[PDB]
């Protein structure tokens, strides 16, 4: 039940919800970026450390 402009107002609801989903995506993407550099760091650090110790 919306006038010719309240339809657009609640469309700005739905678009701000797409924005909230994009912000949740940004938060989870950054958090998984944090997790991923940690994981890849652990992996490659272990590989390099192992190679150095075997050579030693």
């Amino acid at each position: 039940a919306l006038s010719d402009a309240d339809v657009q107002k609640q469309i700005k609801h739905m678009m701000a919800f797409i924005e909230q989903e994009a912000n949740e995506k940004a938060e989870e993407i950054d958090a998984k970026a944090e997790e991923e550099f940690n994981i890849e760091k652990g992996r490659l650090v272990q590989t390099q450390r192992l190679k150095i110790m075997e050579y030693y």
């Binding site: 039940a1 919306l2 006038s3 609801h13 919800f17 909230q20 989903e21």
Partner: protein
Amino acid sequence: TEFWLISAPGEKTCQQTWEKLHAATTKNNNLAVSSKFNIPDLKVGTLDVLVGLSDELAKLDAFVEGVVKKVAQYMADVLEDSKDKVQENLLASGVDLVTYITRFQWDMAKYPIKQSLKNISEIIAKGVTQIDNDLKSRASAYNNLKGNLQNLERKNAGSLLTRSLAEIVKKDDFVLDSEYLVTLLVVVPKLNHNDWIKQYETLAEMVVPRSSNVLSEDQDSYLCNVTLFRKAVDDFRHKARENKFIVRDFQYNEEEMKADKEEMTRLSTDKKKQFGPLVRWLKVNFSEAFIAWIHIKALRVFVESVLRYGLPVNFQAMLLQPNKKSVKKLREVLHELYKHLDSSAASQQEYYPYVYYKIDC
């Protein structure tokens, strides 16, 4: 008890006091009991998944409604200090039911809003389901106990023809260490008790004479017996059944009758001892369950309000208790007071211009 809950867009900050006692948006001219609901604030989470979330939440709400009504029905089927008719004043966690719906308390510790609202709904489902399974087990076990009592009383129910003679006769009433004889307990009614005491000699042969000694006399038929040869049991029964001499071969046993009676007394005392705590467990199960139910009802109302009103979490609701037979006048007045909220599209049927769900007995 019937109770109403209405939510609104909340376009003005004066609605903080209008939730309590507005005069212009009063109900029944400041006569209906109105108090602002203890409104929390929760995250949005989703909207595309939210419609189906609210639908399945309504299905689960009907499910838990059935669960709590089933708990109340069972506690009434206990039929002692808790019934649908008498002693029905069962307090909501030690506080009166009306008093707790009017003073509902909302907590974050049990159910963090930071989690998904689906997470909370499924945790509620898990808890209520464990309660329900424990309730089915409790029903089976304790009603089996009550049925054991009832069936042991069924063994204590009936005339002496079907009721044991543990405390009526003695071990010596028959011939212990019989040579070739059997003290057949041919119970004869009172219409014919005076006849066997003379006919016993002729009713069979190869028997013990002077076997006219009666044992006991009962309202339906007089207990009595007669001693006779093992093969002659057949002949005496066939001759005596025609003169109204009912045959009932009773066996005496002190040990087994005593054991059965001791089992009966054990079951009675243990049943009281299990029945007290049974009421306690039923009370706490029903207790935690309705508090979860009022919480989940408030959650569904919140979800519907967020669906309808707008991106802000600015919304304003309140309980409502109409006076009887004036709630149609409220239907009209609140239609007027809430139609200007929409002012366009929303026949009505169930899609009211306001938010509402009904709570009842």
